[PDB]
Amino acid sequence: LNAKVRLLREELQLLQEQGSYVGEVVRAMDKKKVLVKVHPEGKFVVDVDKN
């Protein structure tokens, strides 16, 4: 119950972080980059995290 209250009490800052776009990958390429369509905008050549 203590954990639940702590999570609820923090949730106000966690919910003020930005969001993340949803993109459709076109094809992985190059060292570790990918070409991602970000509906409705255009394509990008983005980096890929470590995980």
Interface residues toward other proteins, by CB under 8 A: 35, 41-47
Those residues whose C-beta lies under 8 Å from the C-beta of residue 12, and which sit 6 or more positions away, are: none
The least distance separating other proteins from the CB of residue 20, rounded to whole angstroms, comes to 13
- Residue 42, by phi and psi: left (phi above 0), alpha (psi -120 to 50) or beta? beta
The least distance separating other proteins from the CB of residue 50, rounded to whole angstroms, comes to 14
Nearest to residue 22, comparing CAs of 46, 4, 50? 46
The least distance separating other proteins from the CB of residue 44, rounded to whole angstroms, comes to 6
Residue 19 or 42 having the CB closest to other proteins: 42
